[PDB]
Amino acid sequence: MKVRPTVSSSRRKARKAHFSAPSSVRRVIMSAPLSKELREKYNVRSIPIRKGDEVQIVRGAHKDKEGKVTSVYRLKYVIHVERVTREKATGQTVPIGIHPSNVVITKLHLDKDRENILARIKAGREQVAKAKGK
């Protein structure tokens, strides 16, 4: 149960905040879990998704498909994986919008800021591990 008076359990306010969110808040919302191997390697559970990550889809009709994220459409709250596409009536191959919660990141697009994010998350998790151990 929420205790802090600043938190709201209103369904109306939560839906308004979700569907009227800025682009950076949408970045934070559009997060994906890491793979098992990356979770043991970096000690990080989930990261906000970005273009250039290689993911595997674990839910939906396109399960077990892998590919590189070529677009992060924050407005439509969806990502566009490579070769996971469709066909229009005319025959054009349009991408299929997949929610980032339905994928698992198998390879990260490692830059300096992403390494900083991973280091901060790992430091917090290990400091809570120290707090739990003693």
Binding site: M1, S9, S10, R11
Partner: protein, 260 residues
């Protein structure tokens, strides 16, 4: 709204025209113009007897009657057929006023939720907790739009002594769905008779029983009520040598044979 329904500029057309005598909106270039107003019978009108905030929302109850009800609920909680008639799964519970030792819940022994779950499962309160977990259903009606989306049953009420057990056990029983915690000095009738139905399942501590002896002598202006009946067993009253001896012979049977 105080002004809802009647923040309209409308006048009655009178008996000049062959229309109903209702105040209609003035103007001549709107869909609204010409429509009736100021009535519970009218669309976009003021309703009959608008609700006001100075309705009586709260009820004053005498403290003596509240203490009588709390004592009656406590007495009903010590009867196990009332516990199952209320809807509690206590068929594996060893004794109905389920007293556990305070050493199991003293300090930080139950302050973690896993330890509280283990204690509930060990003392026999497991099935009641699992009932609440499996009874989660979505609420029928518009209350889902108003912050009440789910409904579930009520599990065991933990009554403890905050002086002798501390308040760290409150944290360990908080996340377990259904189980509730209440100090022995501030018992709540809304929790002892949920829905107005008597016989709540209660796990006490030992210090809870000792201070339960203690705090009913500390209420000023209240003493534990004397019943108007000493022996509430009617079969003991009627089927006893005392009454059966002076009874005259029966004048008939339970079923009367038809004579003609």
């Amino acid at each position: 709204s105080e002004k809802a329904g009647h923040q309209t500029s409308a006048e009655s057309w009178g008996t000049g025209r062959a229309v109903a005598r209702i105040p209609r909106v003035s103007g001549g270039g709107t869909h609204r113009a010409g429509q009736g107003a100021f009535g519970n019978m009218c669309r976009s009108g003021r309703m009959f007897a608008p609700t006001k905030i100075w309705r009586k929302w709260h009820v004053k109850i005498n403290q003596g009657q509240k203490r009588f009800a709390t004592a009656s609920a406590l007495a009903a909680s010590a009867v196990a057929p009332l516990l199952m008639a209320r809807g509690h799964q206590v068929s594996t519970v060893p004794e109905v006023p389920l007293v556990v030792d305070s050493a199991a819940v003293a300090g930080d022994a139950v302050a973690k939720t896993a330890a509280a779950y283990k204690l509930l499962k060990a003392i026999g309160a497991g099935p009641d907790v699992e009932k609440v977990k499996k009874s989660k259903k979505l609420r029928a009606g518009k209350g889902k739009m108003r912050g009440r989306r789910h409904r579930q049953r009520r599990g065991p009420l933990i009554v403890y002594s905050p002086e002798h057990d501390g308040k760290e056990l409150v944290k360990g029983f908080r996340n377990i769905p259904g189980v509730e915690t209440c100090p022995v000095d501030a018992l709540n009738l809304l929790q002892l008779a949920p829905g107005g139905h008597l016989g709540r399942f209660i796990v006490w501590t030992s210090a809870a029983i000792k201070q339960l002896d203690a705090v009913y002598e500390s209420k000023k202006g209240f003493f534990l009520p004397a019943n108007i009946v000493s022996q509430a067993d009617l079969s003991r009253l009627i089927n006893s040598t005392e009454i059966q001896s002076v009874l005259r012979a029966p004048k008939g049977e339970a079923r009367t044979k038809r004579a003609c």
